[PDB]
């Protein structure tokens, strides 16, 4: 075992590896969305910028978990990163609806990992999740839900989607 390992359960080590892959998959989804919105027949640069930033942050989130794995003396095991569920994301509202679902899928995973850490009496790990993940996840879900409501108000299609796009830019 690692010279640094102390009070680090192998179930928590395994779940951290699962989370690393999930964060990376989410980064891939938002990368796909970002360049979809730069197609010459889509051309929503506000949405595109929103999802590039989203993609960048998910990748930083994955790296924080990799760095965390090493800090506790666990071993990073990287798996294939699945292809995004879609190539083409449709309207702005549909991409936001997919992003809301993905964020809540990641949040449930984060909450399950917290329950695993709690049951294994790992307060260093529960503190990591509460500090660096569960807070941003809740604010992220709130922000996308707000944006869906505003987009439905503005449009959601036609002139409204055009005017809404200018606010994410």
CB nearer to Fe ion: pick between 137 and 168: 137
Among a copy of itself, Fe ion, none, the one that 139 touches (CB under a kind-dependent 5 to 8 A) is a copy of itself
Rule CB under 5 A: is residue 72 a binding residue for Fe ion?
no
Q: Restricting to residues 4-23, which ones interact with Fe ion according to CB under 5 A?
A: 23
Q: Where on the phi/psi map is residue 44: left (φ > 0), alpha (ψ -120 to 50), or beta?
A: beta
- d(C-alpha 19, C-alpha 116), whole Å: 13
CA quadruple 67, 105, 87, 84: dihedral sign: positive
Rule CB under 5 A: is residue 58 a binding residue for Fe ion?
yes
Among a copy of itself, Fe ion, none, the one that 105 touches (CB under a kind-dependent 5 to 8 A) is none
Among Fe ion, a copy of itself, none, the one that 10 touches (CB under a kind-dependent 5 to 8 A) is none
Site map 22..51 versus Fe ion, x via CB under 5 A = -x----------------------------
Q: Closest Cα partner for 66 from 112, 136, 13, 106?
A: 13
Instruction: Report cis status (omega within 30 of 0) of the bond before 144.
Output: no
Q: Please pick, from the candidates 17, 51, 61, 102, the single residue that binds Fe ion as defined by CB under 5 A.
A: 61
- d(C-alpha 156, C-alpha 154), whole Å: 6
Rule CB under 5 A: is residue 114 a binding residue for Fe ion?
no
Least separation in angstroms between CB 32 and Fe ion: 16
Burial class, 153, CB count within 10 angstroms (exposed 0-12 / middle 13-18 / buried 19+) = exposed
Among Fe ion, a copy of itself, none, the one that 61 touches (CB under a kind-dependent 5 to 8 A) is Fe ion
Contact residues toward Fe ion (CB under 5 A) are 23, 58, 61
């Amino acid at each position: 075992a690692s010279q640094v390992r102390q009070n680090y359960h192998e179930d928590c080590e395994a779940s951290i590896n699962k989370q690393i892959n999930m964060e990376l998959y989410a980064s891939y989804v938002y990368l796909s969305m970002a360049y979809y919105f730069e197609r010459d027949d889509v051309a929503l640069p506000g949405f595109a910028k929103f999802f590039k930033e989203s993609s960048d942050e998910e990748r930083e989130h994955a790296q924080t978990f990799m760095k965390y794995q090493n800090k506790r003396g666990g071993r990073i095991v990287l798996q294939q990163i699945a292809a995004p569920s879609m190539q083409e994301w449709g309207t702005g509202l549909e991409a936001l609806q997919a992003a809301l679902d993905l964020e809540k899928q990641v949040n449930q995973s984060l909450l399950e990992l917290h329950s695993t850490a709690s049951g294994n009496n790992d307060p260093h790990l529960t503190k990591l999740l509460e500090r660096e993940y569960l807070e941003e996840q809740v604010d992220s879900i709130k922000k996308i839900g707000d944006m869906i409501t505003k987009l439905k108000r503005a449009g959601p299609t036609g002139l409204g989607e055009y005017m809404f796009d200018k606010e994410l830019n």
